[PDB]
Write an enzyme that holds these catalytic residues in place. Structure first.
Site, PDB file in Angstrom:
ATOM      1  N   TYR A   1       1.908 -15.460 -54.096  1.00 60.93           N
ATOM      2  CA  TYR A   1       1.650 -16.836 -53.668  1.00 60.93           C
ATOM      3  C   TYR A   1       2.752 -17.783 -54.138  1.00 60.93           C
ATOM      4  O   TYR A   1       2.513 -18.963 -54.404  1.00 60.93           O
ATOM      5  CB  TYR A   1       0.281 -17.320 -54.145  1.00 60.93           C
ATOM      6  CG  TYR A   1      -0.859 -16.475 -53.633  1.00 60.93           C
ATOM      7  CD1 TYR A   1      -1.246 -16.540 -52.304  1.00 60.93           C
ATOM      8  CD2 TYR A   1      -1.547 -15.610 -54.475  1.00 60.93           C
ATOM      9  CE1 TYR A   1      -2.281 -15.775 -51.824  1.00 60.93           C
ATOM     10  CE2 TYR A   1      -2.593 -14.840 -54.003  1.00 60.93           C
ATOM     11  CZ  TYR A   1      -2.951 -14.929 -52.677  1.00 60.93           C
ATOM     12  OH  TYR A   1      -3.985 -14.170 -52.189  1.00 60.93           O
ATOM     13  N   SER A   2       3.971 -17.268 -54.237  1.00 65.89           N
ATOM     14  CA  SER A   2       5.073 -18.050 -54.770  1.00 65.89           C
ATOM     15  C   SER A   2       5.504 -19.117 -53.768  1.00 65.89           C
ATOM     16  O   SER A   2       5.388 -18.942 -52.553  1.00 65.89           O
ATOM     17  CB  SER A   2       6.248 -17.128 -55.093  1.00 65.89           C
ATOM     18  OG  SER A   2       7.237 -17.805 -55.840  1.00 65.89           O
ATOM     19  N   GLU A   3       5.981 -20.248 -54.297  1.00 71.08           N
ATOM     20  CA  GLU A   3       6.530 -21.343 -53.504  1.00 71.08           C
ATOM     21  C   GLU A   3       7.884 -21.739 -54.100  1.00 71.08           C
ATOM     22  O   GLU A   3       8.084 -22.842 -54.602  1.00 71.08           O
ATOM     23  CB  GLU A   3       5.556 -22.513 -53.439  1.00 71.08           C
ATOM     24  CG  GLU A   3       4.185 -22.160 -52.885  1.00 71.08           C
ATOM     25  CD  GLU A   3       4.211 -21.771 -51.413  1.00 71.08           C
ATOM     26  OE1 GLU A   3       5.123 -22.216 -50.688  1.00 71.08           O
ATOM     27  OE2 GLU A   3       3.305 -21.024 -50.978  1.00 71.08           O
ATOM     28  N   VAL A   4       8.819 -20.798 -54.044  1.00 65.75           N
ATOM     29  CA  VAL A   4      10.184 -20.988 -54.511  1.00 65.75           C
ATOM     30  C   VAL A   4      11.090 -20.917 -53.297  1.00 65.75           C
ATOM     31  O   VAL A   4      11.038 -19.943 -52.539  1.00 65.75           O
ATOM     32  CB  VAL A   4      10.575 -19.907 -55.533  1.00 65.75           C
ATOM     33  CG1 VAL A   4      11.989 -20.087 -55.962  1.00 65.75           C
ATOM     34  CG2 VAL A   4       9.638 -19.941 -56.737  1.00 65.75           C
TER      35      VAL A   4
ATOM     36  N   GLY B   1      11.874 -14.694 -53.075  1.00 66.41           N
ATOM     37  CA  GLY B   1      10.921 -13.923 -53.850  1.00 66.41           C
ATOM     38  C   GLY B   1      10.085 -12.983 -52.997  1.00 66.41           C
ATOM     39  O   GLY B   1      10.111 -13.006 -51.763  1.00 66.41           O
TER      40      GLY B   1
ATOM     41  N   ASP C   1       7.044 -14.106 -71.352  1.00 63.20           N
ATOM     42  CA  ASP C   1       6.824 -13.486 -70.049  1.00 63.20           C
ATOM     43  C   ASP C   1       8.064 -12.727 -69.613  1.00 63.20           C
ATOM     44  O   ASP C   1       8.464 -12.766 -68.450  1.00 63.20           O
ATOM     45  CB  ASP C   1       6.396 -14.506 -69.003  1.00 63.20           C
ATOM     46  CG  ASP C   1       5.738 -13.894 -67.777  1.00 63.20           C
ATOM     47  OD1 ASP C   1       5.240 -12.751 -67.874  1.00 63.20           O
ATOM     48  OD2 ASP C   1       5.716 -14.600 -66.744  1.00 63.20           O
TER      49      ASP C   1
HETATM   50  N1  LIG Z   1      16.932 -19.922 -59.904  1.00 64.90           N
HETATM   51  C1  LIG Z   1      16.572 -18.927 -58.947  1.00 64.90           C
HETATM   52  N2  LIG Z   1      17.484 -18.409 -58.144  1.00 64.90           N
HETATM   53  C2  LIG Z   1      17.170 -17.474 -57.252  1.00 64.90           C
HETATM   54  N3  LIG Z   1      15.939 -17.008 -57.085  1.00 64.90           N
HETATM   55  C3  LIG Z   1      14.991 -17.505 -57.879  1.00 64.90           C
HETATM   56  C4  LIG Z   1      15.246 -18.481 -58.844  1.00 64.90           C
HETATM   57  N4  LIG Z   1      14.096 -18.797 -59.490  1.00 64.90           N
HETATM   58  C5  LIG Z   1      13.160 -18.039 -58.899  1.00 64.90           C
HETATM   59  N5  LIG Z   1      13.688 -17.254 -57.952  1.00 64.90           N
HETATM   60  C6  LIG Z   1      13.033 -16.264 -57.102  1.00 64.90           C
HETATM   61  O1  LIG Z   1      11.515 -16.716 -57.023  1.00 64.90           O
HETATM   62  C7  LIG Z   1      10.832 -15.722 -57.512  1.00 64.90           C
HETATM   63  C8  LIG Z   1       9.662 -16.297 -58.315  1.00 64.90           C
HETATM   64  O2  LIG Z   1      10.181 -17.095 -59.349  1.00 64.90           O
HETATM   65  P1  LIG Z   1       9.193 -17.433 -60.572  1.00 64.90           P
HETATM   66  O3  LIG Z   1       9.620 -18.539 -61.358  1.00 64.90           O
HETATM   67  O4  LIG Z   1       8.915 -16.230 -61.391  1.00 64.90           O
HETATM   68  O5  LIG Z   1       7.882 -17.868 -59.722  1.00 64.90           O
HETATM   69  P2  LIG Z   1       6.348 -17.604 -60.193  1.00 64.90           P
HETATM   70  O6  LIG Z   1       5.438 -18.057 -59.082  1.00 64.90           O
HETATM   71  O7  LIG Z   1       6.097 -18.447 -61.427  1.00 64.90           O
HETATM   72  N6  LIG Z   1       6.056 -15.971 -60.604  1.00 64.90           N
HETATM   73  P3  LIG Z   1       5.346 -15.445 -62.083  1.00 64.90           P
HETATM   74  O8  LIG Z   1       6.423 -14.655 -62.833  1.00 64.90           O
HETATM   75  O9  LIG Z   1       4.182 -14.562 -61.714  1.00 64.90           O
HETATM   76  O10 LIG Z   1       4.838 -16.572 -62.959  1.00 64.90           O
HETATM   77  C9  LIG Z   1      11.794 -14.912 -58.427  1.00 64.90           C
HETATM   78  O11 LIG Z   1      11.333 -13.644 -58.648  1.00 64.90           O
HETATM   79  C10 LIG Z   1      13.036 -15.027 -57.562  1.00 64.90           C
HETATM   80  O12 LIG Z   1      12.900 -14.014 -56.435  1.00 64.90           O
HETATM   81 MG   LIG Z   2       8.019 -15.372 -62.674  1.00 65.32          MG
END
Ligand SMILES: Nc1ncnc2c1ncn2[C@@H]1O[C@H](COP(=O)(O)OP(=O)(O)NP(=O)(O)O)[C@@H](O)[C@H]1O
Ligand SMILES: [Mg+2]
Length: 324
Positions: A45-48, A41, A151
Site C-alpha cells: 500500500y505504498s505511496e512513494v 516500489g 527497521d
Molecule cells: N529516496 C528513494 N529513492 C528511490 N526509491 C525510493 C526512495 N524512497 C523509497 N523508495 C522506494 O519506495 C519504496 C518504499 O519506501 P519506504 O519508505 O520503505 O515506504 P514504506 O511504505 O514506509 N514501506 P515499510 O518499509 O513497510 O515501512 C522503497 O522500497 C523504494 O522502492
Molecule cells: Mg520501508
C-alpha cells in the site's frame, strides 16, 4: 538493566532541542511544487512517487504519509534533519502538504534503486563486502548521532549498483537512544527482529540494528532469504533457536532476568548450536568465506551487548578488501 556499549550518553551531551522531537515544528510547504510522475516500489500500500520539482526541474521522491499521529511525523522529520549529510543516509529535502487534502508528505533525494530480489542474485563476494561496509557506515553514523533505525532490512536499503551507491531509507520507526529507557518491542519486520524483541525485553539499544544487519548478511552470503523465516512472531524465535541453540537462549534470558512466556517451552524444544558452515552448499560456496562466517557469528548473538558495534564490525577482516 542494560545499556549500549557505545554512544550511550551522546544525546544527554547534546542540546535538548536535538532529541526533544515533540517540540520540533515542521514547516509544511505546498506539494503543488511537485509533479508526481511514477509510482516506485513493490507494494505494501505504498505511496512513494518519483517526482519533479516544477520550480527547478529536479528529480526527487515524494512519500505521502498515511494518517498517523503528529508526534510520529515530528519524530521522523527531526531524526532525518539530525542525520542530514550523514554518510549513506537518505537526504530529506522538504516537508510538504497537498493544499486541498492537507495530507503531509516527505520529499527525499532520489536514488536509482534496483530491487534487492533481483540485485542480490548477481552480487559477488566482493560486492557483498562493499555494500555491507557502506551500510555499516550509515549505521555507525546514526548510532553516533544517538539514533536507532529499528527497521533495517533489504527493503529499506537502496542500492544503485551501476554507481555503487547506497542509501539507508525509511526512518519512520527510528528512535533516540537514552540509557535505561524502555522501548516498544513492536518494531522491525518479523524476519529481522532481534531476540530481545521476541522475548519482550524493552531495554534495548543500537545493537538491535546489528542483529538485523546480521540477518541481511546471512541472507546475502547463504542465499536463504529471509534467513530466519518464522511463520509468526513465536515461531520466529524458534527459527533463531534452531541455529543459535536453546541452551544459549536460556543463558541469555538468565543474564538479563527475562521471563520467557511459558507457551514457548513446548515450541522451542531442545536444539544444539549449529556451525555456520552447515549452511554452505553448491549454490552459495562462492559467497562464503571463513572471514564472513566469523563476522556473522559475532553479529547474530542472543546477547545484544556482546554483538559487535557498527564500528567494530567495520574493523573486521571481512572488510579488508573494501576499507581502502
Ligand atoms: N529516496 C528513494 N529513492 C528511490 N526509491 C525510493 C526512495 N524512497 C523509497 N523508495 C522506494 O519506495 C519504496 C518504499 O519506501 P519506504 O519508505 O520503505 O515506504 P514504506 O511504505 O514506509 N514501506 P515499510 O518499509 O513497510 O515501512 C522503497 O522500497 C523504494 O522502492
Ligand atoms: Mg520501508
Amino acid at each position: 538493566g542494560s545499556r549500549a556499549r557505545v554512544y550511550a550518553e551522546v544525546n544527554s551531551l547534546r542540546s535538548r532541542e536535538y532529541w526533544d522531537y515533540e517540540a520540533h515544528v515542521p514547516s509544511w510547504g505546498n506539494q503543488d511544487d511537485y509533479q508526481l510522475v511514477r509510482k516506485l516500489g513493490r507494494g505494501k500500500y505504498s505511496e512513494v512517487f518519483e517526482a519533479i520539482n516544477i520550480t527547478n526541474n529536479e528529480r526527487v521522491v515524494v512519500k505521502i504519509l498515511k494518517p498517523v499521529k503528529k508526534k510520529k511525523i515530528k519524530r521522523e522529520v527531526k531524526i532525518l534533519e539530525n542525520l542530514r549529510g550523514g554518510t549513506n543516509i537518505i537526504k530529506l529535502i522538504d516537508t510538504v502538504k497537498d493544499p486541498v487534502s492537507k495530507t503531509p508528505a516527505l520529499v527525499f533525494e532520489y536514488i536509482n534503486n534496483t530491487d534487492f530480489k533481483q540485485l542480490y542474485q548477481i552480487l559477488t563476494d566482493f560486492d557483498i563486502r562493499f555494500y555491507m561496509y557502506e551500510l555499516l557506515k550509515a549505521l555507525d553514523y546514526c548510532h553516533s548521532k544517538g539514533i536507532m533505525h529499528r527497521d533495517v532490512k533489504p527493503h529499506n536499503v537502496m542500492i544503485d549498483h551501476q554507481q555503487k551507491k547506497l542509501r539507508l531509507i525509511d526512518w519512520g520507526l527510528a528512535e533516540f537512544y537514552h540509557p535505561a529507557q524502555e522501548y516498544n518491542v513492536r518494531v522491525a519486520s518479523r524476519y529481522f527482529k532481534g531476540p530481545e524483541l521476541l522475548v519482550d525485553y524493552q531495554m534495548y539499544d543500537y545493537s538491535l540494528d546489528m542483529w538485523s544487519l546480521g540477518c541481511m548478511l546471512a541472507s546475502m552470503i547463504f542465499r536463504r532469504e529471509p534467513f530466519f523465516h518464522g511463520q509468526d512472531n513465536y515461531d520466529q524465535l524458534v527459527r533463531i533457536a534452531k541455529v543459535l541453540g536453546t541452551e544459549e537462549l536460556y543463558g541469555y534470558l538468565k543474564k538479563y532476568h527475562i521471563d520467557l512466556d511459558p507457551h514457548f517451552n513446548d515450541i522451542l524444544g531442545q536444539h544444539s548450536r549449529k556451525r555456520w558452515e552447515n549452511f554452505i552448499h553448491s549454490e552459495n560456496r562462492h559467497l562464503v568465506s571463513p572471514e564472513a562466517l566469523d563476522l556473522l557469528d559475532k553479529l547474530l548473538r542472543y546477547d545484544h551487548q556482546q554483538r559487535l558495534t557498527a564500528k567494530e564490525a567495520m574493523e573486521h577482516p571481512y572488510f579488508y578488501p573494501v576499507v581502502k
